[PDB]
Amino acid sequence: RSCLENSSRPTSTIWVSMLARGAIGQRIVATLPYIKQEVPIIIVFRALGFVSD
Amino acid sequence: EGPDAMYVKLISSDGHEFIVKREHALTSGTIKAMLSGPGQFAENETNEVNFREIPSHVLSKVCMYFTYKVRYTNSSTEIPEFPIAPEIALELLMAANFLDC
Amino acid sequence: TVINNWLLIEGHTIGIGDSIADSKTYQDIQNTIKKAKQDVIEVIEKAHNNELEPTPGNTLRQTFENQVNRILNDARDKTGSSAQKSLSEYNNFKSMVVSGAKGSKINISQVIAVVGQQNVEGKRIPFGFKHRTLPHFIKDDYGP
Amino acid sequence: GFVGIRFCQECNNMLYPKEDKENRILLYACRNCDYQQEADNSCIYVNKITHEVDELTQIIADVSQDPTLPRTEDHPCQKCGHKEAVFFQSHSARAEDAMRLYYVCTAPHCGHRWTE
Amino acid sequence: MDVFLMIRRHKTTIFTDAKESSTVFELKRIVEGILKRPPDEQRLYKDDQLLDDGKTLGECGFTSQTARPQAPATVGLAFRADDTFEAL
Amino acid sequence: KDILCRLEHTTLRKVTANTAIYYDPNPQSTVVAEDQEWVNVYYISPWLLRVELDRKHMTDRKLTMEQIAEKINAGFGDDLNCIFNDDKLVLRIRIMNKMDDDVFLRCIESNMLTDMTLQGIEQISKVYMHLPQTDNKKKIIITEDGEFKALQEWILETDGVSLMRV
Amino acid sequence: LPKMMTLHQQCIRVLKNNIDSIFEVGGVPYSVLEPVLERCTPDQLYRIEEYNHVLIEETDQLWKVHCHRDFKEERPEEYESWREMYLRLQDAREQ
Amino acid sequence: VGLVKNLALMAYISVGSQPSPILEFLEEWSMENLEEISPAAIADATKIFVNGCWVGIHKDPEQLMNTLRKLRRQMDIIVSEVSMIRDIREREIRIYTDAGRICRPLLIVEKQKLLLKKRHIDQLKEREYNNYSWQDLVASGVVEYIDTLEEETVMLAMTPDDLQEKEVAYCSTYTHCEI
Ligand SMILES: [Zn+2]
Ligand SMILES: [Zn+2]
């Protein structure tokens, strides 16, 4: 529940979750604020500016 | 002090010398090397053990510890400790030099 | 009406002297508690040195918990039995228990001898800190 | 034994296992760029279902500085002979089946960790 | 069990070992055996409680505590029964 | 205990120590090299699934490796060949005859670990044997003399319900 | 304490509990005093060495046990015994 | 029941502080920023969190926590209500300055001895003569405020009788004592 210090603003909550076993493997996804669907975490890292694995 | 060796006299350059059971001074390291010197059999029975520079109460504690340790080693009891005063331990530690224990 | 008017002559009370046991009883309770704590420490040492054999149908931690709770329940039961055995015929806790009016032998045991094990959700007090019930204990303290 | 991630060098991405039937051997190939590399270990994937018997390698020596950990002087260090050592149970989810004690030497510059 | 008394004559202290009941002049006898002390020269003083004219060790002054290997109980000595009582 | 083993569900996961995936295009020269002798006794995709089973789980379930092998063969109908030996309990699985065979063997290994039954009934996770000391769950009988006699007989509990199969 | 102790061990365990009681050692060699000084903390070593100066050139290796515990990233330079290095870095860090 | 709670008598809820002095001090007390480090240095170092912000890593976390505790105990750069937690097993140092942290004052114990001496008690017996107050006791490095996250790393003696204990004290590393 991320909230910027030195300011009075609402807290933005990010959920870095992992899918259950029941699926070839279990994957890590990210539920971002103001985003309707879950996003895979590697896509978020690439959109942050790091394309290489 | 008597040549029948179950009492041995020992002096520390103080007036208050001490005479103790040889059998309860048996746990000395140096009783095997300066009463059991170059040859046994009436070297021990002289019982003039003229040590130097030890205050009286210090070696009183040391030889009372001798009786203590002899009768509390290999007996039915093994737990108990030795209650030395904190300061005298320093000079008692120099007794820790002499007796090889 | 008849019993309530005879009770004016007889009277019934509860006092702090009904919570006292004999000195011999207090010694017996302290001895039982000491022996049971020693037994719990021995079971802890057996589990720590991997000498504790799991029972069928249960894992090692739950067999340890069952053994510890068995020891402590035996402690509470024996101390309580000594507590009721100390009680005189004039004891008013005993009077209200054997009359069935109020209280039980567990209440007498907790007042006189041992309150006993505190349980939350059917287990012992959980490690709400990192592996500690309270910050006054050391980590991984499974003692009573 | 375990298998790790082997990385490409052209784009630093992940190499995926693949075979060549002309050489009939195993190679880790990058499928972002066109890089290929002959694979050293034949093991592609391994399960470790009951290979959680070890917990000593995850323990760090810094827990010798933990004041809330129990200390003993009856378990001397084998590597350096220090008399004092902290002991604790395993903190893993694999520790439900074991109350096994692990010991860490509290002497600085040693950090030796052992079991019973 | 044991006994622990520093037989203290100022600058000469005798060591003894005995049990909880022994006649108190047998202490003088075991001093006499090696230190050549006649019973005139063996006027043992009191304890903190008065000494034992009944002549046993399980009588006044001596308890189960005074047989302490941790630290004994000490008292002065005079090697003359009636004439003089020499300290130092 | 025999009935308890016949009732409790046993997947391959309960008895497997490890599963490893290898590139072994020539079974004549096994890359693992600890299975050379019995594979050469027996002697195909170049992909190998090596399954090592724990000793204790295979003993107390009273399972022998031939039963697991015929369970493989019945499960897949010779879509894939599984050889085995032990004297380490070693199985070796290949897939005889665009979704490369490594991910297909991935998938069938997931099927091994999850969706295969060795012995027991699927809905029953755990079976607790006990001998009851109370008359609530005993076998009361009427003797020849005519008394009600309580017989202590071993009874099982389950953690799932598959009543008709039981 | 279910342990037997000889005179060395008795004196050094008592003194290992009350290091703070030491003002002046008298004439004890360090080789005897080696145990109680290794279970110690550098301020007490400074106190001992500034009351019992004759021990100084004996205790320098002991300071290494402190240095690699308080300045583990460091090494001595040449012409630097461990006591003077520990005091120089300690005062430099406080400053 | 259980949802509505009450404060303990010496419980104090923290009011909040700016992280800037602690951040500056960490920047020039040998902590390297996240922007200036290769990731290979993160594996053996201690991550440093200030109000939950990962700001850098430190190579010597024990002397860093000693320095931070020394600063907070003498009411230097770090103010008294700042919580500093060293997760030793997880190699993390978390510094919290934000509001809402409930804490309580505890006597500081160094080497099985209270830092509260008879001189502090004698000075506090004449509170309205010496002008010695509770805040002077905090500034003396005698008491300090510990919150719930820091309390999970401290070792509390219930009484000073737990300190003055013989050969088996059940713990020889008490860090704090209940008042
Ligand atoms: Zn590439
Ligand atoms: Zn070590």
Swiss-Prot record, chain B:
Localized where? Answer: Nucleus
Say which domain of life the source belongs to.
Answer: Eukaryota
Quote a single Gene Ontology cellular component term: nucleoplasm
Q: Which UniProt keywords are listed?
A: Host-virus interaction, Nucleus, Transcription, Transcription regulation, Ubl conjugation, Ubl conjugation pathway
InterPro entries in alphabetical order: ELC1, SKP1-like, SKP1/BTB/POZ_sf, Skp1_comp_POZ
Pathway listed for it is: Protein modification; protein ubiquitination
Entry's Gene Ontology molecular function annotations:
protein-macromolecule adaptor activity; transcription corepressor binding
Post-translational modification here is noted as: Ubiquitinated by the DCX(AMBRA1) complex, leading to its degradation by the proteasome.
Report, as the record phrases it, the tissue specificity of this protein: Overexpressed in prostate cancer cell line PC-3 and breast cancer cell line SK-BR-3.
PANTHER family, alphabetized: ELONGIN-C
Subunit and partners: Heterotrimer of an A (ELOA, ELOA2 or ELOA3P), ELOB and ELOC subunit. The elongin BC complex interacts with EPOP; leading to recruit the elongin BC complex to Polycomb group (PcG) target genes, thereby restricting excessive activity of the PRC2/EED-EZH2 complex.
According to its UniProt record, which protein family does this protein belong to? Belongs to the SKP1 family.
Name this protein carries in UniProt: Elongin-C
In its UniProt entry, the species of origin is given as Homo sapiens
Curated annotation (Swiss-Prot), chain C:
Report the PTM annotation: The tandem heptapeptide repeats in the C-terminal domain (CTD) can be highly phosphorylated. The phosphorylation activates Pol II. Phosphorylation occurs mainly at residues 'Ser-2' and 'Ser-5' of the heptapeptide repeat and is mediated, at least, by CDK7 and CDK9. POLR2A associated with DNA is specifically phosphorylated at 'Ser-5' of the CTD by CDK7, promoting transcription initiation by triggering dissociation from DNA. Phosphorylated at 'Ser-2', Ser-5' and 'Ser-7' of the CTD by CDK9 (P-TEFb complex), promoting transcription elongation. Among tandem heptapeptide repeats of the C-terminal domain (CTD) some do not match the Y-S-P-T-S-P-S consensus, the seventh serine residue 'Ser-7' being replaced by a lysine. 'Lys-7' in these non-consensus heptapeptide repeats can be alternatively acetylated, methylated and dimethylated. EP300 is one of the enzyme able to acetylate 'Lys-7'. Acetylation at 'Lys-7' of non-consensus heptapeptide repeats is associated with 'Ser-2' phosphorylation and active transcription. Regulates initiation or early elongation steps of transcription specially for inducible genes.
Segment forming the signal sequence = none
> Which superkingdom, per the lineage?
Eukaryota
Q: State the compartments where it is located.
A: Nucleus; Cytoplasm; Chromosome
Coiled-coil segments? none
Family stated for the protein in its record: Belongs to the RNA polymerase beta' chain family.
**Annotated source species:** Cricetulus griseus
Gene that encodes it? POLR2A
Curated annotation (Swiss-Prot), chain D:
Q: How does it assemble?
A: Component of the RNA polymerase II (Pol II) complex consisting of 12 subunits.
Q: Which organism is it from?
A: Sus scrofa
* Pfam families in alphabetical order: Zn_ribbon_RPB9, Zn_ribbon_TFIIS
Q: Which residues bind Zn(2+) 2?
A: 77, 80, 105, 110
GO CC annotation:
nucleolus; nucleus; RNA polymerase II, core complex
Q: Where are the zinc fingers (TFIIS-type)?
A: 73-115
| Protein name as catalogued | DNA-directed RNA polymerase II subunit RPB9
User: What PANTHER family does the record tag this protein with?
Assistant: DNA-DIRECTED RNA POLYMERASE, DNA-DIRECTED RNA POLYMERASE II SUBUNIT RPB9
Q: Which residues form a coiled coil?
A: none
Superkingdom of source: Eukaryota
Give GO BP annotations, semicolon-separated.
maintenance of transcriptional fidelity during transcription elongation by RNA polymerase II; transcription by RNA polymerase II; transcription initiation at RNA polymerase II promoter; transcription-coupled nucleotide-excision repair
Give the ZnF (C4-type) ranges: 8-33
Name the cystine pairs.
none
Mind telling me which SMART domains this protein's record contains? Answer: RPOL9, ZnF_C2C2
State whether keyword Nucleus applies: yes
Q: Which UniProt keywords apply?
A: Acetylation, DNA-directed RNA polymerase, Metal-binding, Nucleus, Transcription, Zinc, Zinc-finger
The gene from which this protein is expressed is: POLR2I
| Binding positions (Zn(2+) 1) | 8, 11, 30, 33
Localization annotation = Nucleus, Nucleolus
Q: Which InterPro entries match?
A: DNA-dir_RNA_pol-M_15_CS (IPR019761), Rpa12/Rpb9/Rpc10/TFS (IPR012164), Zn_ribbon_RPB9 (IPR001529), Zn_ribbon_RPB9_C (IPR034012), Znf_TFIIS (IPR001222)
Q: Which GO terms describe its molecular function?
A: DNA-directed RNA polymerase activity; nucleic acid binding; zinc ion binding
Name the family the entry cites: Belongs to the archaeal RpoM/eukaryotic RPA12/RPB9/RPC11 RNA polymerase family.
Swiss-Prot record, chain G:
What segment(s) does the record annotate as region BC-box? 6-15
> Where does this one sit in the cell?
Nucleus
Start and end of every F-box domain?
Answer: 22-66
| Subunit description | Heterotrimer of an A (ELOA, ELOA2 or ELOA3P), ELOB and ELOC subunit. Part of a multisubunit ubiquitin ligase complex consisting of elongin BC complex (ELOB and ELOC), elongin A/ELOA, RBX1 and CUL5. Interacts with ERCC6; the interaction is induced by DNA damaging agents or inhibitors of RNA polymerase II elongation. Interacts (via BC-box) with CUL5.
- Domain comment, in the record's words? The BC-box, which mediates binding to the elongin BC complex, has the consensus sequence [APST]-L-x(3)-C-x(3)-[AILV].
Q: What does this protein do?
A: SIII, also known as elongin, is a general transcription elongation factor that increases the RNA polymerase II transcription elongation past template-encoded arresting sites. Subunit A is transcriptionally active and its transcription activity is strongly enhanced by binding to the dimeric complex of the SIII regulatory subunits B and C (elongin BC complex). As part of a multisubunit complex composed of elongin BC complex (ELOB and ELOC), elongin A/ELOA, RBX1 and CUL5; polyubiquitinates monoubiquitinated POLR2A.
What's the name of the protein?
Answer: Elongin-A
Origin organism is Homo sapiens
What lineage does the source organism belong to?
Eukaryota, Metazoa, Chordata, Craniata, Vertebrata
